[PDB]
Design an enzyme around this catalytic site. Structure first.
Site, PDB file in Angstrom:
ATOM      1  N   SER C  53      67.563  91.211  33.829  1.00  0.00           N
ATOM      2  CA  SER C  53      66.668  91.629  34.895  1.00  0.00           C
ATOM      3  C   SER C  53      66.681  93.171  35.031  1.00  0.00           C
ATOM      4  O   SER C  53      66.590  93.863  34.023  1.00  0.00           O
ATOM      5  CB  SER C  53      67.085  90.908  36.180  1.00  0.00           C
ATOM      6  N   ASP C 191      62.684  85.691  33.543  1.00  0.00           N
ATOM      7  CA  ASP C 191      63.968  86.344  33.872  1.00  0.00           C
ATOM      8  C   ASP C 191      65.202  85.694  33.231  1.00  0.00           C
ATOM      9  O   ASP C 191      65.310  84.471  33.164  1.00  0.00           O
ATOM     10  CB  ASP C 191      64.119  86.335  35.400  1.00  0.00           C
TER      11      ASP C 191
END
EC number: 3.1.1.-
Lengths: 362, 359, 360
Positions: C53, C191
């Site tokens: 991330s 993600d």
């Protein structure tokens, strides 16, 4: 004046052959700090320490920074020591190739010591010096000091005899024989070997003790006359000890060692023990008087490779030695005390500078 | 957080022993001057509150009263010299047959000479100076604030300074007059702050600050007793070693009032040091902020150094010595850290907080 | 020590990336001071840098070569990147049916910043995670191995957007690559938190261990020798149990959308806990506890808990938790602060680099 002013300052340097490059590197850093702090490039170690003790190359170092030159100033600045090693080290530790006798004949060593020291005698030292040795004939340690010689002119020996003696390590250099003279003019003989043999590879406790005794008649040292370690400021420098992951040994392998194997390493072991024990005695004393910070011991405890030998004057090893010296400055003084030796030394420097100033103000 | 923290300095009473905290403060102010590269830096530039009792109060008045330049009248390094020079004249036996050991005339003279007509409302920081009124039978705490409504408490610094140091049997209690809103006369009959139980005014100082936080946005951060935002430096004047002038119940069993009056003040002074430190350590620890509170105290005074009125040259000199030695003593039990290092740390926090507070 | 392998790992967390960025700023500064070289960059001291991330974005920025072939960005540039672009990255699209953000701006900036740089160009070994919702498998982008599989040598901005494309926050990412034979290779990524590596510490260590099977450089930890492993793992903090945390009683009345609103923060927090547990277990078992430094804030409160609050006031509070985290102790009962521990870590990194160059 402030407590600082009446304090007694002592510098002590361990023996160690070329490893003397390490403490020399540290002293170079220290003298530089003092010169910077007092804005005086002419500032020398001997101007701040009441006593300077040394054994072996630590004794040579002591002789060079305490012997007066033509201007009556320390013969050598700290920054000159390492270069002395790089230039003369290889010639001092140049294997003679003799079947019998030590590894080196020591001829060159004495030559250079005579060249630089000249005919200076210990009574001329710019501060109180303490240089150790052991007399294999009288079977007793012989400590050369600057004071006291009034009655015993036999101890007022030439600096180069003292300097060679303190570094004459068994199996490395030939023991030294030189003559002096008594009050009545009678001859006084010396038969000396390295001060390590006298148990003082680390002479810091010996140095403080000499100072304590001097305090029995020298008003200058009156302040530590009754063992008041609270008024003692001590900087003790080592030449490092072998890492337990390097040339160290087990009982199992030592089983089949012969006498020569033991002689090849016994000296390194006692030197390391002397560093440990002497530091133990002193930490005990200073701590007992809540003056832990009055004593700064700068030692490398993890030498590896060629760096362990007091014998290796090769270019590559002397360079590594300069490196352990530079890195030591970056290591911390203790555990969970992030403070590095570099910062501690700066603090010590400030104390030395302030004391000299207070001695001048009052 | 740092910038939100409230800083407080507290100084115990102790007569001539004020030389000890003065020595400590000299070291501290010097550190701050060095740290901020400003020899003009003064203690009052870093502490929001300064509390003092007896000579601790005199010290407070001198480093908090504004001079002609509106700067602290005295630098920390000027305090010890003040003692060596005026100490012997302040503690000069009147030899009077009746009354205190000293008439206190010289003490007041010098306090007037040095503080002039300055008034407490003029202090450069919040000050807390203690005393006890033997007439109203209540402690009287002189503070820089709250005076808006009660102009009777905005007394002259030398009246406050003498009062806080007027120890029973040592100096005559002090009577001085002030004025109320309606112009009516307000009378004070004061003696040393030790009598008010605050020989160690640190908790009293912290408390004054907490109360001020009820109306002074500046102190809003410790408004609800948040000791986590409290930075406190508390200085003592030392206590007698148990191997010195201390006593057994056996010898005391037959003591008269003559013996007791000779030793009671020093005992309660020492108890105040112990108890106040106990209250505070309890509070700070409970809030995991042990390091927010620094107490510098000597617990083993011997010989002449136990007396608060011994202004002989030799004793003042020994006092400077306990002060210098205190700096190298460990802060506690087996805490190898010395007071000197702790103070350096405290100094760094003070300096950092001030910078932030600016930009 | 010169034998040791160094690894840096950064957790995901949206704008909370400001916290580890703050820590890294302090670290790089220390290294610059230590080596008297303001040009010193994190990538010069770490053999591996892993991120998930915003931790992955951070990784891309400090490992992608600029025109001078130096790290594109200095640690001290990261927080400013967040304050400037954060508000525009987390700008609500208001598009009734879809993620809260369209992610257009995020990709714009990533393209502007990383140019056409490709992973194989990273200055150190990088490990950036993501999860492919089509193949139903984690996809770990690494700088090495690509020799045989050119399909994984993706563009840094594709990798960077992907690693940060959190479900319900940003649209998953599609992009195409090419195989040896020239055939198209498709990616459908979200993600890396979905791949369960919100804390990629152990994944990074593992990538290094595997590389050691063919890269003589990593030969030293080839047989899982954690004694020769130096690892710095940074977190983005977890919610305080006295803040937005919940009871079984209240969650019994929750709808599925209520769960989707908080489940990600829960698994992220668990990932931090578990990964740290796995690592502490391994390092301790090899009497090398100090070889592993984990810097994490365990008590976030207020606006600070949210990974997409890029308001000025919140990003400022985040800089604050980062600065305060520096003063906190590293372990329960062990007064030493993270600040001191990091200085120690810094010294080790500096010393190791010296020994690697001294005998070269």
């Amino acid at each position: 004046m402030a407590q600082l002013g009446e304090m007694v300052t002592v510098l002590s340097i361990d023996g160690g052959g070329i490893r003397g490059i390490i403490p020399a590197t540290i002293l170079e850093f220290l003298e530089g700090q003092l010169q910077e702090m007092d804005n005086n490039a002419d500032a020398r170690l001997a101007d701040y320490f009441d006593v300077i003790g040394g054994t072996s190359t630590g004794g040579l170092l002591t002789a060079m920074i305490s012997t007066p030159n033509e201007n009556n100033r320390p013969f050598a600045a700290a920054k000159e020591i390492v270069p002395f090693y790089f230039e003369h080290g290889p010639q001092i530790f140049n294997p003679s190739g003799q079947i019998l006798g030590p590894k080196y004949d020591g001829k060159y060593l004495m030559q250079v010591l005579q060249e630089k020291l000249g005919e200076t005698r210990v009574h001329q030292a710019l501060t109180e010096v303490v240089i150790s040795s052991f007399d294999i004939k009288t079977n007793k340690p012989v400590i050369f000091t600057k004071s006291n010689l009034a009655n015993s002119p036999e101890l007022d020996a030439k600096m180069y005899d003292i300097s060679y003696s303190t570094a004459a390590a068994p199996t490395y250099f030939p023991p030294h024989y030189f003559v002096t003279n008594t009050s009545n003019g009678d001859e006084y003989e010396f038969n000396l070997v390295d001060g390590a043999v006298a148990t003082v590879a680390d002479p810091a406790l010996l140095s403080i003790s000499v100072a304590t005794r001097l305090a029995q008649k020298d008003p200058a040292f009156a302040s530590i006359r009754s063992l008041n370690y609270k008024k003692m400021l001590l900087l003790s420098l080592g030449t490092g000890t072998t890492s337990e992951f390097d040339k160290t040994y087990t009982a199992k392998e030592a089983a089949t060692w012969t006498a020569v194997h033991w002689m090849l390493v016994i000296q390194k072991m006692t030197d390391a023990a002397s560093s440990y024990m002497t530091d133990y005695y002193l930490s005990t004393a200073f701590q007992a008087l809540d003056s832990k910070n009055n004593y700064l011991r700068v030692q490398e405890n993890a030498l590896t490779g060629t760096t362990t030998e007091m014998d290796d004057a090769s270019e590559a090893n002397m360079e590594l030695l300069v490196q352990v010296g530079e890195n030591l400055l970056k290591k911390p003084v203790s555990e969970d005390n992030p403070e590095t030796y570099e910062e501690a030394l700066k603090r010590f420097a400030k104390l030395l500078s302030d004391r000299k100033k207070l001695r001048a103000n009052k």
